[PDB]
Symmetry: D2
Subunit: 243 residues, 4 copies
Amino acid sequence: IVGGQEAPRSKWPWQVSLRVHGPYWMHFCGGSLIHPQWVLTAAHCVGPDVKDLAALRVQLREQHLYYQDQLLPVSRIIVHPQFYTAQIGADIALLELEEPVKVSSHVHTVTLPPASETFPPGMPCWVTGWGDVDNDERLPPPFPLKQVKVPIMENHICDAKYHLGAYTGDDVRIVRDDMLCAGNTRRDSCQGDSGGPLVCKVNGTWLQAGVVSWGEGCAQPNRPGIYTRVTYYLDWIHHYVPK
Amino acid sequence: IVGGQEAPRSKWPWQVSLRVHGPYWMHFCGGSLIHPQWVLTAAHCVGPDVKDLAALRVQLREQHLYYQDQLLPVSRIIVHPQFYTAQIGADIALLELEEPVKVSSHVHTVTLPPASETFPPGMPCWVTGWGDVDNDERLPPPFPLKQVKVPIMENHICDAKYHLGAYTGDDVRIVRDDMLCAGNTRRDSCQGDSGGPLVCKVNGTWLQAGVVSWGEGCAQPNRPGIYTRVTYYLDWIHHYVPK
Amino acid sequence: IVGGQEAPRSKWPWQVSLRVHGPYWMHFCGGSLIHPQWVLTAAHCVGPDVKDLAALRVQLREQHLYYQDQLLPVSRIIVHPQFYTAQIGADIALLELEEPVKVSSHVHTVTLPPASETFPPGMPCWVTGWGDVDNDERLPPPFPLKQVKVPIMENHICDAKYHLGAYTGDDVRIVRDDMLCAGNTRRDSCQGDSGGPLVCKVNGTWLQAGVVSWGEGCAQPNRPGIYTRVTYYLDWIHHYVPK
Amino acid sequence: IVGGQEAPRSKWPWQVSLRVHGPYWMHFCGGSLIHPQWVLTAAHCVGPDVKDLAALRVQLREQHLYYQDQLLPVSRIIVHPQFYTAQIGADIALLELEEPVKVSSHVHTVTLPPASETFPPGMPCWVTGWGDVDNDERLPPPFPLKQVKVPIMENHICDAKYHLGAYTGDDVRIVRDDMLCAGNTRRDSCQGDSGGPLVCKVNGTWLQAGVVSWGEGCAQPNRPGIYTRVTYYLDWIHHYVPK
Ligand SMILES: CSc1cc(C(=O)N2CCC(c3cccc(CN)c3)CC2)cc([Si](C)(C)O[Si](C)(C)c2cc(SC)cc(C(=O)N3CCC(c4cccc(CN)c4)CC3)c2)c1
Ligand SMILES: CSc1cc(C(=O)N2CCC(c3cccc(CN)c3)CC2)cc([Si](C)(C)O[Si](C)(C)c2cc(SC)cc(C(=O)N3CCC(c4cccc(CN)c4)CC3)c2)c1
């Protein structure tokens, strides 16, 4: 997370950390708990190549990475079948846990948006995670969960920005319709935040608008953060995740 | 080049090395001389973001990088306006030299196929360059130009290979019609060979079939080298480059 | 610590971590609390070149680095004036804290041997720290304090081992009289354990025999861990540190 | 080499490159040819641990590293028996080739000094090699041999400089009598130059005064280059090398 601050303990009870087995169970991506037995993340975190489930664990909301881990194994990885890269799109995946988790005030699910929410500019939205705090700059020990409030920008404006300084033709769309843009040169998500939630407070309720997907670097001029737009994927999600 | 050998000095007289200004004029990509004043390369070598022309140079056929350079300035970079990443396609670009080269025995142009050329599956073709000799293993000093023989394959087969051990749906296309595949777990192009030529000798004439574009790593199981298919962009190339 | 395990929280109440200012207060060396206001460490951790006192802090006994630090400022660094490199010797230093620590169950001083103490060859001693778990392999998060049991050996034996597979003449001394050796190919101190304590329980009392100083790598054949011999510098230590 | 320039072809016909076997025969140190079958280098290049001769080669004077190698194997490594580290001293070694080399105007031996030469300040002296051109900055391709003219400074002045900014006691000698000091903040030897020659022109004849040994970094204030003083080691050399 570029900018923002350490999250209070009482916030974002749905944030998860994904871990891969190596010299230690290392954090490589975020996620969100959307049901007691399902985690929502980015496909590029766990694909497009098939991975060994045994080498994967999930860790539920922790204030500091690694310090009080209780790692949960995963029975299934479902990756959106149109996923190949994040720039093409469908950067979205589901992790099914081997057991349903017990929920509490500090660990519980996030609400998905109804299909028709657009998340226009000026909505209040936060992104969270344990990624880099700037380009090629890791989150320091003790690895506190960070949050940063990020401005949403309309897709056609974001797409036009991405064309600035580029050879790509103006009519060749960069930012796709299944994506959402947010952030600026002070406030952004970054590497290690992928797969985590962008959430907005609508009519009193926190809703997941996006999954951290990609960008050109982190907090660079005219290159805002790109997120998988969750509304585009609700039917796919509900094919696997009970309501 | 993975699984290759050093090229004899009489061969590949069209090969070029692209150089970027830092502590020295470092090689970052290959190219091919297709006209006395024009180099054909990959877009991803030089875009999608516009970079400074003064920081770029071209080096013509050389047995050993850096030893006896004669570096040529570039007057123009033309990047296909559809390019944004290699996986989406249109990974092709032209460099116009400030001067025509005085062509010779050691240096000369490669012939581009006619639009109708069907390079048959299995045809033995050659890819050349100064890239990595395996995954994350750089070509050692003294940086001899390498060559490797690689069998062309049908896009349908290469697509189906990319889908083995992958979550991507089988009907979702990974290898596209503007691409061409070649190579296997012993023979392949690699990082720093990008932009460089895949050539096939067809009824006795060396034709450029492909531009080194991308892959999942180098020489991995079921992940052949992917090349921009030259016949596909013939008209765009001829829009700028004289016959 | 190589070939060790995580220390129980009741043990090694004298262990300290030295911290240097960068992007965070990074651990670079261990130390031992030998008086409420004094830390014993290795000179090479802080010299031979004079560095800024404000960039240094001390952290007292902690189960996991970084998690719940309470960092203590240092009012003075005293480096043995004979020190220039560990191989020459006099690798020993004192840090005077700005304040006496309020000693307790969890935090307290280690006892230094009397000048006459002959720690016998073979005696089982313990070395503790947050250093590397093998050559060029850093202690993983969450950075638990480790311990390992290491047999003391006679300098004459350790010297002769250092000379095996070496050009150094057999009469030319490598391990010196102000040094003490311990460890084997399974058990040893390592990089980042430097300055930290080698302790032996002698007729029921934990005495500090050594300061982690140097070695040829960690846990290599015929290259035991070398430690500054505490009895040797007792008078210098007592020149500054009250009984 | 820090400062100075690429050496003309016609100079330093006695410079050698030492190579270790890995992905390629990589340069790790210099040396000088002092007899057709003997090379003079620094012990720390090839010790103090016994190394496998088969993994070692010597390369005689080359204008550019790697480009026209003819590597020679070594039958014997003789390391000064008092060597353990460079700061202790006796940083000197001999490589015996399996065959005597043929000498020419471009490849031939350097003259050793008579025992009584002191090489006082103001003598004109050059150091040569293929090392780093500044701290942690490698010599770029095409790796030209560099030279730099360096001022000699008297041992007691150099030793006093090394004490400046240090904890080490003023009467604890840092720069030993078997060493020689040369260089300043613009002109110095560096990592990869070790084992190579410092040579001075005395009464018309080029003489090797030093072997590149150590220092604190390269071209830092008050930290000039330190060399093994060849006059101290002439009897040892002549025990092995015919006159
Ligand atoms: C199977 S597709 C694929 C393959 C590879 C791969 O294996 N490669 C590349 C191809 C190479 C090659 C070359 C020549 C020949 C051959 C044939 N054998 C192969 C071998 C090695 C690598 C990638 Si990759 C994931 C490494 O893409 Si890019 C680093 C070039 C990339 C592309 C883009 S598009 C503008 C942005 C960024 C980038 O800036 N990132 C990634 C996203 C990060 C991020 C994360 C989270 C949030 C945000 C928003 N602030 C940003 C920031 C850093 C990075 C993709
Ligand atoms: C002012 S004295 C000095 C200076 C430098 C330094 O600045 N250098 C080296 C010389 C270079 C140079 C070359 C040519 C010319 C010039 C002149 N311009 C300079 C410049 C860079 C470096 C050192 Si240094 C600390 C980097 O010594 Si060594 C890496 C060669 C070394 C020497 C020895 S002696 C056998 C062992 C190890 C080693 O294996 N270690 C260190 C100890 C560690 C350790 C720590 C704790 C416990 C244990 C026990 N298992 C082991 C393990 C790794 C390492 C010391």
